[PDB]
Amino acid sequence: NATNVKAMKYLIEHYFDNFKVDSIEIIGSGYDSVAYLVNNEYIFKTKFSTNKKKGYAKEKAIYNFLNTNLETNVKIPNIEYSYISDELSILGYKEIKGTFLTPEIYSTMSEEEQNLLKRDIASFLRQMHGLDYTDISECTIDNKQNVLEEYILLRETIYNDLTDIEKDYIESFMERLNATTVFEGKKCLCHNDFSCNHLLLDGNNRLTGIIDFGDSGIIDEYCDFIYLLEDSEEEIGTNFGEDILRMYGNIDIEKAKEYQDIVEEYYPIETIVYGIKNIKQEFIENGRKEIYKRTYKD
Numbered sequence: 620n621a622t623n624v625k626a627m628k629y630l631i632e633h634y635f636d637n638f639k640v641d642s643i644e645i646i647g648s649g650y651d652s653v654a655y656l657v658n659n660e661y662i663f664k665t666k667f668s669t670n671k672k673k674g675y676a677k678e679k680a681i682y683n684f685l686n687t688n689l690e691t692n693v694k695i696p697n698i699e700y701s702y703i704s705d706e707l708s709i710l711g712y713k714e715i716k717g718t719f720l721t722p723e724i725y726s727t728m729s730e731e732e733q734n735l736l737k738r739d740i741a742s743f744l745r746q747m748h749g750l751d752y753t754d755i756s757e758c759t760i761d762n763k764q765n766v767l768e769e770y771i772l773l774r775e776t777i778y779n780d781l782t783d784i785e786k787d788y789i790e791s792f793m794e795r796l797n798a799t800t801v802f803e804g805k806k807c808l809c810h811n812d813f814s815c816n817h818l819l820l821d822g823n824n825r826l827t828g829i830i831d832f833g834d835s836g837i838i839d840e841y842c843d844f845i846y847l848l849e850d851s852e853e854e855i856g857t858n859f860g861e862d863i864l865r866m867y868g869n870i871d872i873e874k875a876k877e878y879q880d881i882v883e884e885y886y887p888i889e890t891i892v893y894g895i896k897n898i899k900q901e902f903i904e905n906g907r908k909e910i911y912k913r914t915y916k917d
């Protein structure tokens with residue numbers, strides 16, 4: 620699958636006059652994006668037509684805001700090339716180098732190395748969350764309202780074809796969402812996809828870089844702890860997130876956990892909604908199945 624590499628080479632050279640592509644390979648991808656390593660130096664992140672028709676616009680505005688206002692040794696993407704349209708968007712920045720944090724690597728770190736990493740993370744988040752965001756005040760994200768809208772989308776599309784069990788899982792979520800107070804806390808600029816696969820380590824196992832601020836915005840402070848608190852094979856574990864919360868300070872840990880638990884409870888619904896919005900039946904099917912699996916866990 621080389622048609623897309625060649626296509627991307629052409630597009631890069633076409634949209635960015637005087638950029639020459641000597642080498643190009645795919646080095647990663649997201650749900651709707653592919654990331655290309657170009658000349659062993661640049662990342663070119665690309666998306667074709669999607670629901671976020673101004674998505675890379677926002678992401679770029681965020682990198683610009685952060686590179687202007689953050690004071691940190693931690694690297695983030697600094698945008699040098701951009702092309703943005705309904706049908707195609709491209710962000711180009713110098714590759715952030717290092718090794719992605721994994722549970723395996725963490726477990727080979729000394730206790731001190733682990734603490735320092737935790738400190739590095741706490742300190743970064745503290746700095747970002749503390750930025751006055753009045754300048755990008757429009758990049759607000761209201762997760763509660765979004766779920767409400769997504770629920771309405773469900774009601775308008777497939778809800779009536781759902782089973783009672785599926786419906787009950789959804790309504791039960793909605794009821795919990797209506798009762799929770801976890802949205803009524805501090806709002807601030809968050810990375811909002813803060814998992815260990817976006818965290819880069821240098822050769823001393825210290826945090827050297829953070830990527831993918833594609834979902835960032837002004838949102839509940841709790842958001843950036845959701846994956847740090849996650850107990851799964853992909854993430855490091857709850858104790859890791861707890862310790863980081865303590866280092867970060869001034870934050871209700873139980874509430875951060877409740878927030879994580881609610882996001883986790885929503886995931887199958889999110890999956891279904893993605894399936895609907897992007898016309899991908901496989902995602903609707905997986906989300907529904909996942910509801911059954913969780914209903915039967917107990």
Ligand SMILES: Nc1nc2c(ncn2[C@@H]2O[C@H](COP(=O)(O)OP(=O)(O)O)[C@@H](O)[C@H]2O)c(=O)[nH]1
Pocket residue numbers: 646647648649650651652653654662664713714715716717816830831832833
């Ligand atoms: N090492 C490294 N990998 C990157 C960099 N930028 C992107 N990637 C890889 O490309 C993937 C997709 O980038 P990302 O912004 O996460 O895409 P999104 O998940 O679609 O928003 C990431 O998960 C990484 O694997 C970078 O600057 N350094």
Ligand SMILES: [Cl-]
Pocket residue numbers: 900903904907
């Ligand atoms: Cl289905």
Ligand SMILES: [Mg+2]
Pocket residue numbers: 649831
């Ligand atoms: Mg990503």
Ligand SMILES: [Mg+2]
Pocket residue numbers: 649812831832833834
């Ligand atoms: Mg992203």
